[PDB]
């Protein structure tokens, strides 16, 4: 049901959450993106993407969105987020695939 | 401001990683983190403690009952199940159930081999659930009683006059409605005593505590002027000053309050408030002397933690915590030989009647 | 006239000072532990019922009267 | 393969910050994390415990060679200390301490909320020193018992001859030496019954 936390990943995510609490959002965002890349996990990637969006960063947001979409292609929210992010980036073919996936489901 | 302590996080992560492997059973990381939370909470101060998805309902019950039950109290003494008395204002009482009724089978489960906790759990349940009990009265033919669980309010205050003009009041455990119940009890006492009563004795003995709001409400019900009790804490919001409103039904009647070792949190608040204002006389043994006002901060997943938010002070500034409020009379339970059965209450009644006759008569 | 026989309790309820890591009192005064009590000499009030009643009545009157 | 329960760690961080905010006394997060570790270990397994660096150094060697012990050996049960066994020939054994006895208070101090290792350490004391305990048997009335601390000598095995060919050998406690003493003791019995025991 739930995967096991690896020691380094556990420590990194714990410090990231604490830093995000302490308003030092920079460390939290960096740790979140690094750990999302390392772990390629759906929930961690989504949390990192949301944190990046709140911080207003783009390149980190693009990377997190791509990682979330690749790790969790099933979720339609991931498809929409990746589509918008990569349409902002400039690439549309994968955005077209994401829109096709959305059309497969009950979405715009 | 200061950087996060990476050494502490590092040691915590190392300990968790090593425990999840060296241990001798499969441990889900959820369990380890939950136990870590319980550890960080329960080890700070003895009273504070995390609450799970279940115990929170238990605390809500203890504060204010409003629970689905048949209104029957069963006590297990010498391994035997018996009813002290049916709870008033319950369907069971209207069903003819009387004290001492012996239930031979609980929904087909014989009472033999059942612990008190099991019987309590079986009897208690969601309101509206039918329950069938086979009961034998005076060794007669067994009869089946069908009942529907309904929301029943548990009594918080009881009274019984030992003599015309002298009344005795008892508080078991403070609840949200305890203030209204105390006001109603005083009104009924006045009505049945023609509105004039020589004296009133109070019984907080072995009263653990409860909601601070209701304790202050009772203090206001008795006291008329001054500041009842105020709390100081690290966070500004925790600070709160409570003062007695001029409204007062007690009519300045003489008042003796008993404080036993059990009275810990709310009973001690009432006792300290009354004693600090020179409005009543405290007797008994030294109280628990715990000072702590805790808030059950809500949290996700129904598990709301409970932390010692702030401390309180008696109006004079004395800190009850770790000390307690020493009673003036200092009457310790003992046997007297030449109501009457309760030596502490007998002493309280005698002192109150003497102090009523010496002055104002 | 009567005699009051003070009784002892084998097990005494632990006071808040007994619990491990009890918080310090706000006033900062000395704590009150659950030390065993044994008066070297019994006070007269404990012996005769009448004296105890009179002493308690005096205490109550003085307290309630507010000096 | 499976998701990482990151929500659990988020909840833990939330709880830590909220506790450090609303607590009455300024508590450094060092204390919070230490208590988290301690309670995690204690709740997961009653016997286990996180030994600190200074405690670990104290764990390596005993403070005093002549240090005395009461003799009772306890083991946590349902979060409440339980007297597993009174070792024979010790002051606690002389009293009415029996297996299954539940210790409520030691030295007039509740032990419900403390760890087994801490309770055992509190039980230990200087040789020839008084101590008090509260005992509950089969849900009985908790009663106080006073004992005198003393240095405990196991005596290892105890042997005697019951009948011409029937012998009785009791093992009070399993220390280091007993591993061999039994055999020696057995030899004596084998010597005193013509080499054969019924």
Author numbering:
A (entry chain G): 44 to 151
B (entry chain E): 38 to 375, 414 to 436
C (entry chain B): 370 to 436
D (entry chain F): 38 to 235
Excerpt from the paper describing this PDB structure:
To address this question, we further refined the class IV EM map in which all three LbcA molecules are on the front side of the CtpA hexamer, which enabled the application of the C3 symmetry to improve the map quality and resolution. We improved the map to an overall resolution of 3.9 Å. We found that the movements of the PDZ domain, the core domain, and the NDR of the active CtpA in the LbcA-bound CtpA hexamer are comparable to those observed in the locally refined LbcA–CtpA dimer complex. However, the threefold symmetric complex structure reveals that the CDR helix H8 (aa 419–433) of the active CtpA shifts up by one helical turn, in response to the large changes in the upper region. These changes help maintain the trimer-of-dimers configuration of the CtpA complex bound to three LbcA. We found that the long loop (aa 376–411) that is disordered in the CtpA-alone hexamer structure becomes ordered in the LbcA–CtpA complex structure, and we now call it the trans-interacting loop (TIL). In the back view of the complex structure, the TIL loop from the inactive CtpA’ of the lower left CtpA dimer projects upward and inserts into a space in the top CtpA dimer between the PDZ of the inactive CtpA’ and the core domain of the active CtpA. Analysis of the structural features of TIL showed that the TIL Glu-385’ and Asn-394’ hydrogen bond with the active site His-84 and Gln-360, respectively. In addition to the polar interactions, the TIL residues Phe-383’ and Leu-388’ form a hydrophobic cluster with Phe-325 of the activated CtpA and Pro-147 of the inactive PDZ. As the TIL is specific for CtpA and is ordered only in the CtpA hexamer bound to three LbcA, it is likely that the loop’s function is primarily related to the active CtpA hexamer.
